[PDB]
Amino acid sequence: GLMQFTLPVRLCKEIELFHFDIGPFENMWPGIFVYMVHRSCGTSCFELEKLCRFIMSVKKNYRRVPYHNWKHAVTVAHCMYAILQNNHTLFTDLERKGLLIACLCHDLDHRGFSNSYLQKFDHPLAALYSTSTMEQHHFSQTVSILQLEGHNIFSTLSSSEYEQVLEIIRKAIIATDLALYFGNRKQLEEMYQTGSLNLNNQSHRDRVIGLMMTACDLCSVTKLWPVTKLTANDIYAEFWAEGDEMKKLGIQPIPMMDRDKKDEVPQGQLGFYNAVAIPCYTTLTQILPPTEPLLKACRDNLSQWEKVIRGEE
Numbered sequence: 211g212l213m214q215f216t217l218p219v220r221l222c223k224e225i226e227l228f229h230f231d232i233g234p235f236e237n238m239w240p241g242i243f244v245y246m247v248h249r250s251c252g253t254s255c256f257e258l259e260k261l262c263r264f265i266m267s268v269k270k271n272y273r274r275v276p277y278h279n280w281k282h283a284v285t286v287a288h289c290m291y292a293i294l295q296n297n298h299t300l301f302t303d304l305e306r307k308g309l310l311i312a313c314l315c316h317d318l319d320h321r322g323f324s325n326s327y328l329q330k331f332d333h334p335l336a337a338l339y340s341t342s343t344m345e346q347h348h349f350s351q352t353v354s355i356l357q358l359e360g361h362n363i364f365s366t367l368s369s370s371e372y373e374q375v376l377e378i379i380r381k382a383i384i385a386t387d388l389a390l391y392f393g394n395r396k397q398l399e400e401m402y403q404t405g406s407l408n409l410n411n412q413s414h415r416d417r418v419i420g421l422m423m424t425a426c427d428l429c430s431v432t433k434l435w436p437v438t439k440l441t442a443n444d445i446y447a448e449f450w451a452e453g454d455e456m457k458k459l460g461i462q463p464i465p466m467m468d469r470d471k472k473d474e475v476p477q478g479q480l481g482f483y484n485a486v487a488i489p490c491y492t493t494l495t496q497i498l499p500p501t502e503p504l505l506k507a508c509r510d511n512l513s514q515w516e517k518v519i520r521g522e523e
């Protein structure tokens with residue numbers, strides 16, 4: 211009850227900033243998450259013992275892949291913490307509860323392969339879930355862990371509040387399927403520009419939470435340049451293994467996934483900043499002005515990739 215988590219001074223101050231890197235000490239990541247739940251939600255949101263047991267089972271169900279791993283989960287939850295803390299009054303009690311949990315869980319049991327690779331491989335999961343294949347699995351794994359004995363962190367909610375928080379988590383996780391982001395942001399852009407955006411409309415809130423999930427999921431591009439650049443190595447290590455596995459099925463992979471085309475990575479990053487990242491943080495900043503530091507950090511990293519192409523590094 212009277213037991214706060216506290217962090218060393220440098221982490222206590224920097225965890226509040228959008229560009230915080232959670233560091234290489236894995237054993238500190240559970241504590242960092244509990245700290246963020248306690249400040250974002252309250253010390254009463256969750257029974258400490260249940261929350262701790264839930265975090266450790268979630269950790270166990272992330273795999274030892276280069277990028278879609280336990281560090282990505284906590285990193286994405288920290289970006290959500292920074293958004294929620296900078297927008298104190300815009301979100302409900304259930305949303306604050308559900309969204310950090312959704313982010314910790316959003317890539318549960320990821321194997322390092324895209325929805326496309328599962329479909330070309332003819333993986334069983336692609337027959338069980340014809341679209342958003344991995345994201346429906348991630349939500350399935352979240353419910354499994356919530357149902358383990360002593361793991362029900364939502365046990366004090368009413369039946370209808372419990373159904374609402376699991377619906378927030380389901381939509382939040384499904385929204386991390388980047389195939390769905392393009393149309394979600396176009397609708398949000400039109401709604402904001404014609405002045406029809408209404409945060410009392412549930413279908414509108416759902417869309418805005420979707421865009422927050424995309425923004426937290428991509429937050430590698432909003433870090434200081436040396437974090438962004440070193441993280442890109444882990445991203446491509448997965449993509450190039452997927453490309454190798456495409457070649458094993460007798461399919462030329464897209465260039466993004468072909469390690470024989472490393473030289474085109476800088477141009478490929480420009481496309482991604484211009485087609486996905488910048489538009490994402492731009493629309494987010496229009497809807498939630500205090501998230502502007504994400505757009506600014508993203509623009510700084512776009513300018514660093516432009517320098518790589520100009521051979522200035």
Ligand SMILES: O=C(Nc1ccn2nc(-c3ccccc3)nc2c1)c1ccnc(Cl)c1Cl
Nearest residue numbers: 428429430431465466471474475478479482
């Ligand atoms: O890097 C990412 N995406 C992208 C998206 C398109 N292309 N095309 C290329 C490319 C094309 C031709 C030749 C060589 C490379 N490289 C990419 C990387 C990414 C994905 C998911 N999460 C995050 Cl934070 C990021 Cl930063």
Ligand SMILES: [Mg+2]
Nearest residue numbers: 316317386387
């Ligand atoms: Mg994912």
Ligand SMILES: [Zn+2]
Nearest residue numbers: 316317386427
């Ligand atoms: Zn992710």
